[PDB]
Amino acid sequence: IGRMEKALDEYVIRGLRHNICLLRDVVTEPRYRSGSITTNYLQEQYPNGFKKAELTAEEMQLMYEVAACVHLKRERLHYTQGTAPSERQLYLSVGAGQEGETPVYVRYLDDSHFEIGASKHGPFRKMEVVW
Amino acid sequence: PTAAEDLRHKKKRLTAMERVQLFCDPGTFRERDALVEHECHNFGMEKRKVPGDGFITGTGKVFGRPVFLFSHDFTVFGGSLSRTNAAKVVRIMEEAAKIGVPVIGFNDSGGARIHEGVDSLAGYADIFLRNTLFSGVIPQISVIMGPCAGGAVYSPAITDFTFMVETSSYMFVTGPEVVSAVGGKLVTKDELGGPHVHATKSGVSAGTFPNDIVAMAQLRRLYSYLPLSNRDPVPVLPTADERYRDVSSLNTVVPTEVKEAYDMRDVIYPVIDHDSFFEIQPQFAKNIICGFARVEGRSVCIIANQPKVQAGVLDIDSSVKGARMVRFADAFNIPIITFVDVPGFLPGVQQEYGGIIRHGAKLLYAYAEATVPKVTIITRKAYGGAYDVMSSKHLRGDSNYAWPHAEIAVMGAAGACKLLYSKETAEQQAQRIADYEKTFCTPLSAARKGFVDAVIDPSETRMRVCEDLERLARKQLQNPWKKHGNIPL
Amino acid sequence: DVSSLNTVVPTEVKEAYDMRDVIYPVIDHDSFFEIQPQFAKNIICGFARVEGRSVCIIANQPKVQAGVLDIDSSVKGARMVRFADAFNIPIITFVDVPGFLPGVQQEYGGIIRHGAKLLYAYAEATVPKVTIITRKAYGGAYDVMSSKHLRGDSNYAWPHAEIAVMGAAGACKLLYSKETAEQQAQRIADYEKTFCTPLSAARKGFVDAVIDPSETRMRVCEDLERLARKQLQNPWKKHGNIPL
Ligand SMILES: O=CCCCC[C@@H]1SC[C@@H]2NC(=O)N[C@@H]21
Ligand SMILES: O=CCCCC[C@@H]1SC[C@@H]2NC(=O)N[C@@H]21
């Protein structure tokens, strides 16, 4: 299953819609991983239309961190020669109303390594992003 | 400390200094002049002097490259110009003329300052002359953040590109009060000169943005494309994308039926680098696309027809749009890449009553006068004078290519069959139109004459374009000596 | 960090100071090569480096003769400016002048010819120029020492500067012919307060900005880096006709 989970996310499809979200949500459901299912499983678990499951706090935090890293990496490309920055303090907030402003730092110690933290003078984790 | 700007933000609007701070780098703005007064002494203006005098001019720095800018201030006197406001702008433009640096201005003026008399006209004239002289020397970009009325509208017009903000901006020559006075019609300011009107109807505005923040964010991206001056070379940026990336999806873009339509962006996007298109005038004359893009890390100019809208037929507005884009691109040594799909010109009385002859000649003049490297690709068809206009090989074109299902003919098969057989026996349609289209509506004849270099598979377009654009990097061509041309206005 | 420049200028207008205390912090360490050190000591000329590039230095000195322009100083500065411009070398000047040296010997020796040489050299030059007014600039001396109107690139002043037509006494005398006696006390002070300050010259637009003395190195490096590629040309001539 884990393999499928991972393999679903690496399938790049552009130009038309698909049902990969439904497959992902069905596989990730703890009912499906319980061990047994039925033939009325789908409509039993999807009474009104279809609604994809949401994200937990840590997943949304990780998405924020990766977004900040990507922003910094693409920003450094446009600068000329060595006149480029290496650290910022960003304020990420999804939604049109800035729901949950989360301050973020970034350091870009190498080509594919950062020092993400809460802000300046905050403990750093040194994750990795390759894009 | 957030003093004196609470009144501004309460109206859901930003300040000039905040806009300047958002545009440039975090700490690289050096305000030039800050303690200047109007010295008017008329109509009870001897009092209420202001330190900044309603203008903010500085130098700044974007992406490590220098810039010059100025911003109007709406709080102070409504942003009106004077004998003294225009002096700062003139000094900035003169300095940016000595050094090869561009100029960007954020217009917010409410009109002229009446209390100065004709001195406002003097300042306007000086700014107009500087814009006229320095156009083609340094790129000029203008953004309109608020009201812009009176005769001040003309200086943004001479500038290369004008952008507009959606909710709280407008521009026109004469106010609606005079329109009501003379004609008797009641029209609001937005109905007269709103951003939508200039985006779709008049064709003056080159774009529209939803917010000031987005305006700055994308203005930086636009600035990343431009060359610094007239004599400086085209910028080249590092990029991980490579010319060996596979593009085989182009083999299927063109439908096998001649009456079905397709989107030209499906051809434009694969050739250029990923996520590197900046469309210019997206909502005006949609049958033609113009903008900037990068090919192997160097900025190029894109001009292509679109059979999605009106069968990709040339027109007045499309001609003006393409002509302005080509002229600007050539003025600053930027390569041009074109994609051709045209059945001809739009037929109609309104067209001749509006002067198609003048307007359609502008694109041809711009294409013929240009001396930058050109690359042309004929995908499906090219008929009549439209084939000549859209950068044909005879107009000193560098390299021309065609796709295996192209067609290059004098006109459609029906008209040729009609003219070639006056009173030939009836039913001549079936056994003559098919034969003529088979024999002469194909790139074989044009290739025999030598009008296309080679017939290529659609999968090799990126390879060919990168090769040619790399080889043509150092072409030196010059026109005969002239004081200047005489373009059909 | 150069914060020692905040204290170089004394708070009294009649006390003297050494201009080298202003010259040395701005340029790089141990990089001054004085030219003609023992002749016309009221003016200093030489070569120096700013951020690794050679520049030309021309500054007055209130230590010697109140920093007053003269014949010999004019010749020295004119030759230095002409050589520096001939070979595309940036020029940086520091201004502190009360005027020209008064005396019969001066007119009997041709001050009119010699003082025009420095003005000609400053006006003819096309290299980037930077000017800093520390304390004062009066009369034609302000015009001569690379004023903004002579196609100067950037001009700066310090917060206690003074730019006026002449001293307060002469202006008060000419502005009130036979005004009631004791006019000295309540007129000279007022005129010096109102017009012997950089506010008026800044209002007219003759100085770009009024800066803290601690930012001089930053401003000079920024301007000299930006001005690296200026291209200016004079009208066509076989050659000039300088006042010999
Ligand atoms: O066959 C009759 C109408 C054919 C029009 C073909 C297109 S429409 C606009 C353009 N002008 C022409 O003469 N041909 C094309
Ligand atoms: O007040 C009387 C004498 C003031 C002289 C001030 C200095 S001396 C040389 C120069 N020439 C002037 O007119 N003022 C300055």
Tab-separated table of C-alpha atoms in Angstrom, chain B residues 30 32-33 35-37 39 59 61 66 68 95 98-101 228-229 231-232, chain C residues 151 153 199 202-205 207-210 219 222 225-227 229-232:
chain	number	residue	atom	x	y	z
B	30	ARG	CA	18.202	56.049	-1.680
B	32	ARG	CA	17.320	61.689	-3.997
B	33	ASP	CA	15.521	64.927	-3.139
B	35	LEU	CA	13.274	69.078	1.054
B	36	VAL	CA	11.788	71.149	-1.783
B	37	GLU	CA	9.008	73.752	-1.742
B	39	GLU	CA	7.587	78.926	-4.035
B	59	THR	CA	17.466	55.277	-7.447
B	61	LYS	CA	17.991	48.472	-7.138
B	66	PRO	CA	20.151	49.462	-10.985
B	68	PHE	CA	15.440	54.809	-11.453
B	95	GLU	CA	20.784	61.131	-15.303
B	98	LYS	CA	23.744	59.592	-19.291
B	99	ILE	CA	23.961	56.169	-17.616
B	100	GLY	CA	22.379	53.204	-19.359
B	101	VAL	CA	19.538	52.693	-16.861
B	228	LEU	CA	19.568	47.732	-19.297
B	229	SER	CA	20.089	50.164	-22.176
B	231	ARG	CA	23.953	49.477	-26.224
B	232	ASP	CA	23.910	46.682	-23.629
C	151	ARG	CA	27.217	69.178	-14.561
C	153	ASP	CA	26.812	64.156	-10.590
C	199	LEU	CA	17.955	74.597	4.273
C	202	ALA	CA	18.312	72.403	-0.272
C	203	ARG	CA	14.972	74.073	-1.004
C	204	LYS	CA	16.356	75.459	-4.256
C	205	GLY	CA	17.696	72.020	-5.194
C	207	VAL	CA	22.341	69.759	-2.816
C	208	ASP	CA	20.904	66.283	-3.300
C	209	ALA	CA	20.495	65.497	0.393
C	210	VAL	CA	21.654	66.489	3.867
C	219	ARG	CA	27.392	57.244	-0.023
C	222	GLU	CA	27.563	53.656	-3.719
C	225	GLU	CA	30.058	52.212	-8.092
C	226	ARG	CA	26.901	53.349	-9.879
C	227	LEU	CA	28.657	56.040	-11.957
C	229	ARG	CA	29.783	53.795	-16.957
C	230	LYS	CA	28.903	57.440	-17.619
C	231	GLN	CA	29.377	58.652	-21.203
C	232	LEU	CA	29.386	62.426	-21.716
